[PDB]
């Protein structure tokens, strides 16, 4: 949200679920954030480089977090040349 002038007005921008697109609220203590490390040509972890995924409590309580994260990681690894 912005003013007519163009100033940012919101207190903060909440994160969104990587799978459901839902807004992750401040009291959502079932939500998690995961970093998947990247590997070089020799299968060694490159420090500081990873793909970040966030899951809201709703999807994790449903048990669908595993498959959603698997699909998201597969797509992101295909895009990022991590194989």
């Amino acid at each position: 949200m912005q003013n007519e002038e163009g100033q940012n007005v919101d207190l903060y921008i909440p994160r969104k679920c990587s799978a459901t697109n839902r807004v992750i609220t401040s009291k959502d203590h079932a939500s998690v954030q995961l970093n998947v490390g990247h590997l070089d040509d020799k299968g060694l972890y490159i420090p500081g480089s990873f793909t970040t995924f966030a899951l809201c409590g709703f999807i994790r309580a449903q048990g669908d977090a595993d498959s959603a994260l698997d699909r998201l990681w597969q797509k992101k690894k295909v895009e990022a040349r991590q194989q």
Partner: protein
């Protein structure tokens, strides 16, 4: 029996979006349904949808962005003049900054903002946001 195919389509999309599904199925298809979906897609509330031919009313598969809070039908289709749009939006939409009411006017099926722009009235079909 089936009375409003548009209601069934919108309710299926709403339930699927709440469940988090990436795709939903609409059966039977209709040109009113297609126009509603095109209005929704114009504003980024849905992805690509595909019509399936079966030598019958048809079928539609809709991609869901995850941006749809709620889409609904209004029944019966009340008469809405150009001056009643403000009241209808106040009744139905969460805010004046976003959200759309779909009307069927003699100029075609369109959202309420376009109806205000063209100064055309008609009948209310539904809403989405």
């Amino acid at each position: 029996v089936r009375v409003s195919v548009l209601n069934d389509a919108l309710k299926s999309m709403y339930n699927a979006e709440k469940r988090g599904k990436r795709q939903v199925m609409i059966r039977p298809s209709s040109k009113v349904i297609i126009k509603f979906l095109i209005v929704m897609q114009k504003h980024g509330y849905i992805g690509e949808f595909e019509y399936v031919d079966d030598h019958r009313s048809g079928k539609i598969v809709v991609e869901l962005n995850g941006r749809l809070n709620k889409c609904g039908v209004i029944s019966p289709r009340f008469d809405v003049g150009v001056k009643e749009i403000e009241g209808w939006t106040a009744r139905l939409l969460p805010s004046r900054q976003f959200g759309y009411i779909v009307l069927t006017t003699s100029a075609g099926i369109m959202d309420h903002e376009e109806a205000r722009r063209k100064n055309v009235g008609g009948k209310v079909l539904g809403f989405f946001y």
